[PDB]
């Protein structure tokens, strides 16, 4: 209702090519991004210093929908077993906590736009695109109220 109208938290889009990697993340509550993506999330997490959550909005590239919401729950460990994701393109791992597993079609979010990404729809983001807090509130309310 007015729950989401907090003033702390940072929100990022997660774009996965792999449906297998979504399933593994939900099963084991972990994730891994590119090197550049991990560094961005690790900085946001460490600078948050616990004063609020880091939310992750997951969407599989090409699927036409978002598939869930997770919260970051650790910094990035860069020295972990390799080859655990569906493509061996990844060094490291961080903990997440899946908060919401539901398919939300892009049609329900296309009209929200990111002033920090040339006003492109939030549904046209790349991996680890950060969402401004005020637009993030609108997306979460839509996700949590979809049926
Ligand atoms: C390591 C899991 C993963 C898969 C993918 O396709 N993209 C990404 O950023 N992380």
Swiss-Prot record:
Keyword RNA-binding set for record: yes
Residues that hold RNA according to the record: 15-17, 21, 31-32, 61, 85, 90
Conditions for induction: Following heat shock stress.
GO biological process per UniProt: embryonic morphogenesis; endothelial to hematopoietic transition; gamete generation; hematopoietic stem cell proliferation; humoral immune response; innate immune response; mRNA catabolic process; mRNA destabilization
Record comment regarding domains: The disordered regions have the ability to interact with each other and to 'phase separate' into liquid droplets within the cytosol following binding to mRNAs containing multiple m6A-modified residues. This leads to the partition of m6A-containing mRNAs into membraneless compartments, where mRNAs may be stored, degraded or used to transport mRNAs to dendritic arbors in neurons.
Job description of the protein: Specifically recognizes and binds N6-methyladenosine (m6A)-containing RNAs, and regulates their stability. M6A is a modification present at internal sites of mRNAs and some non-coding RNAs and plays a role in mRNA stability and processing. Acts as a regulator of mRNA stability by promoting degradation of m6A-containing mRNAs via interaction with the CCR4-NOT and ribonuclease P/MRP complexes, depending on the context. The YTHDF paralogs (YTHDF1, YTHDF2 and YTHDF3) share m6A-containing mRNAs targets and act redundantly to mediate mRNA degradation and cellular differentiation. (Microbial infection) Promotes viral gene expression and replication of polyomavirus SV40: acts by binding to N6-methyladenosine (m6A)-containing viral RNAs.
Summary of subunit composition and partner proteins: Interacts with CNOT1; interaction is direct and promotes recruitment of the CCR4-NOT complex. Interacts with YTHDF3. Interacts with RIDA/HRSP12; interaction leads to recruitment of the ribonuclease P/MRP complex.
Record-given protein name: YTH domain-containing family protein 2
From-to range in the entire protein, with total length: 408 to 548 of 579
């Amino acid at each position: 209702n007015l729950y989401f109208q907090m003033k702390h938290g940072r929100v990022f889009i997660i774009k996965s090519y792999s449906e297998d990697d979504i399933h593994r993340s939900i099963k084991y509550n972990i994730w891994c991004s590119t090197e550049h993506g991990n560094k961005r999330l690790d900085a946001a997490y460490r600078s948050m210093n616990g004063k609020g959550p880091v939310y992750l909005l997951f969407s599989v590239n090409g699927s036409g929908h978002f598939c869930g919401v997770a919260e970051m729950k650790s910094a990035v460990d860069y020295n972990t077993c390799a080859g655990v994701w569906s493509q061996d393109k990844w060094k490291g791992r961080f903990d997440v906590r899946w908060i919401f597993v539901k398919d939300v079609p892009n049609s329900q979010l296309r009209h929200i736009r990111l002033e920090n990404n040339e006003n492109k729809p939030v549904t046209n983001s790349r991996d680890t695109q950060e969402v401004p807090l005020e637009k993030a509130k609108q997306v979460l309310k839509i996700i949590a109220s979809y049926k």
